[PDB]
Each structure stands twice: as C-alpha cells, then as structure tokens.
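Per-record layout

source: Homo sapiens
name: Titin
length: 99
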Amino acid sequence: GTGPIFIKEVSNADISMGDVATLSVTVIGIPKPKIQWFFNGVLLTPSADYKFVFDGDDHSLIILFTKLEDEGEYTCMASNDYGKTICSAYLKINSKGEG
C-alpha cells in the first residue's frame, strides 16, 4: 500500500501547430492510482480531440489537431488512498498566422 510514484514523468515537447501532441507517464502504487490531466491548472475531460489512454502502468494524453491556444503547462496528477503526486511539462506549439 504505497502512494503513487511516477516511474516516468511527463517531458516538455515542441510541436508545430496542427500536429498531434502527446504527453506520457508511467505510474505505480497500490491501490492502482487514478490519473487526471490539467491545463494551466484546469482539469481536462475526454472529448473528440483529447484522448486519455492507458496500457498497463502507462498513461498518455493525446491532443489531436493542435492550435496555438493549446500551448501551455500540462500537469499529470496521480491519486490513490495513500497520496497524490504530480508532474508537469510545457507544451510549446510553434504556429504561423496573421493578426
């Protein structure tokens, strides 16, 4: 019965606008921790262009069809009966446009 531990924390990433953005972690703990993702501190929910996927101990956030507005600080939080643990990364979206 241990708190959650990030074996693999999220990494910063640089993406061109429109490409797929991914953030990945590996987490362990008993009971199996639950994963949540935040953008500049606000909870993200699954939708057509955000996928919350997992496989075993691995979790990923997948952002399809990125727009400049998706640039910012993404936080992974893992939670179980014995604690809560976070890690964060910066997603930079290199964009082209006109005012």
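summary: Residues 5-93 form a domain with the Immunoglobulin-like fold (CATH 2.60.40.10). The longest strand covers residues 83-94.
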